[PDB]
Amino acid sequence: LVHVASVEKGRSYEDFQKVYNAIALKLREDDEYDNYIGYGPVLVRLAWHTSGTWDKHDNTGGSYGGTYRFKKEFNDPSNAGLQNGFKFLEPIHKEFPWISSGDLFSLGGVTAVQEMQGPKIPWRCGRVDTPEDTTPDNGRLPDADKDADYVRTFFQRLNMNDREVVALMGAHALGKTHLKNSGYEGPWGAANNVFTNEFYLNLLNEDWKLEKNDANNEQWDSKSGYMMLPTDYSLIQDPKYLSIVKEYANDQDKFFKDFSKAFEKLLENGITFPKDAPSPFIFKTLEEQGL
Ligand code: HEM
CATH class of the missing domain: 1.10.520.10 (Peroxidase; domain 1)
Known part of the structure; x- marks a missing residue:
């Protein structure tokens, strides 16, 4: 079309x-x-x-x-x-x-x-x-109970590469999951109505534990009260995604520039x-x- x-x-x-x-x-x-x-x-x-x-x-x-x-x-x-x-x-x-x-x-x-x-x-x-x-x-639209190989293949349908995928997922600094919407509960970080690179910092710096929520789904939780979906956590399990997570955790301006391009x-x-x-x-x- x-x-x-x-x-x-x-x-x-x-x-x-x-x-x-x-x-x-x-x-x-x-x-x-x-x-x-x-x-x-x-x-x-x-x-x-x-x-x-x-x-x-x-x-x-x-x-x-x-x-x-x-x-x-x-x-x-x-x-x-x-x-x-x-x-x-x-x-x-x-x-x-x-x-x-x-x-x-x-x-x-x-x-x-x-x-x-x-x-x-x-x-x-x-x-x-x-x-x-x-x-x-x-x-x-993508499922959250999946691994990095799923994420990568999924985003190929949107013509997104590894850097674009990791940049776009930084939007999970914002807002929260709601158990009644998605079967997941909790926010990804603290400043969840300000757009920052906190998603990547939290991925790398928190002590994450694989827990089950009240909907019987697995999610990663930290003692600070943060959470990551299995697909979020996959970005530090896969070595190619991990390098890019580290890049954006250490360069706020590069994340902003790459997110802007990928989001447009x-x-x-x-x-x-x-x-x-x-x-x-x-x-x-x-x-x-x-x-
Ligand atoms: C593997 C890819 C992704 C998966 C599996 C995924 C999954 C989810 C889930 C399960 C929620 C919680 C919804 C709820 O319970 O209210 C959520 C929320 C959200 N998603 Fe993602 N998402 C993905 C990618 C993205 C991308 C690329 C963006 C934007 C660039 C995005 C933006 C958001 C935002 C801002 C929220 C919070 C909404 C709110 O607070 O009401 N997500 N996502």
């Missing part, structure tokens, strides 16, 4: 900065969600789940079509808990009804990362809603940008605007 980006009619940078600002102001306002984590992490997870359905082999799924709005994908068991992110974005979409669903879900993730003090993520507009019959089937790529997979499409936009944070 070919999905050509088409700019929302007449819109330019200033329009999308206004959407960014509305998301960012609501992140500030709705700060109590999930015991004062706020909505930043769930919006990043939503951006990953809506883009992470992509299949490079046939260009199905991905961010372009905005198909999470349809029942089949909305009710994917892998998407449990993401309804909170969708409901957050509802009043944004009502204020800016011209933005496509795919542009909104992906911009939500960009805004959340930046407003949580993460790297700038260049972002391109022009995803176009596609009909219900284009919704990918359930089962395209994730959100753009499947999309053909015409020769005369606008350049990627770099949005100012509220702090940078004095707002």
Whole structure:
């Protein structure tokens, strides 16, 4: 399939900065969600789940079509808990009804990362809603009860290499697992609504114990109260992933640069940008605007 980006009619940078600002102001306002984590992490997870359905082999799924709005994908068991992110974005979409669903879900993730003090993520507009019959089937998102070989093979379908995989997984600095959503419980670290390289530091520095949670699933726990999924821990079991974990644990700037590239790529997979499409936009944070 070919999905050509088409700019929302007449819109330019200033329009999308206004959407960014509305998301960012609501992140500030709705700060109590999930015991004062706020909505930043769930919006990043939503951006990953809506883009992470992509299949490079046939260009199905991905961010372009905005198909999470349809029942089949909305009710994917892998998407449990993401309804909170969708409901957050509802009043944004009502204020800016011209933005496509795919542009909104992906911009939500960009805004959340930046407003949580993460790297700038260049972002391109022009995803176009596609009909219900284009919704990918359930089962395209990854399982957490797996090893490094599973992780590596899984991410090949998204055209991600080892460095891109390890960089993307650093988003697990954010938020937490919730037993009723995923069968896992606990946060990955302490500063879980600020985007940092703490995921890699915790992997390397904590004393992890393989325990069973209350859903009878194995997860790695530390005495500080942190947790890692089996797939997270696989990044220090595999020697190639381990080298990259060590790199990002020792170089915050390199992690930010590599995450920004990999996250933009994730959100753009499947999309053909015409020769005369606008350049990627770099949005100012509220702090940078004095707002
Ligand atoms: C092997 C790959 C991955 C697996 C197996 C995985 C699995 C999970 C699981 C089980 C949860 C807990 C959901 C819940 O209980 O609420 C979670 C949360 C989360 N995921 Fe991942 N994930 C992966 C990769 C990614 C990537 C690539 C990103 C973004 C770049 C991401 C972003 C997040 C965020 C931010 C949260 C926290 C959400 C919240 O606090 O509500 N994940 N993931």
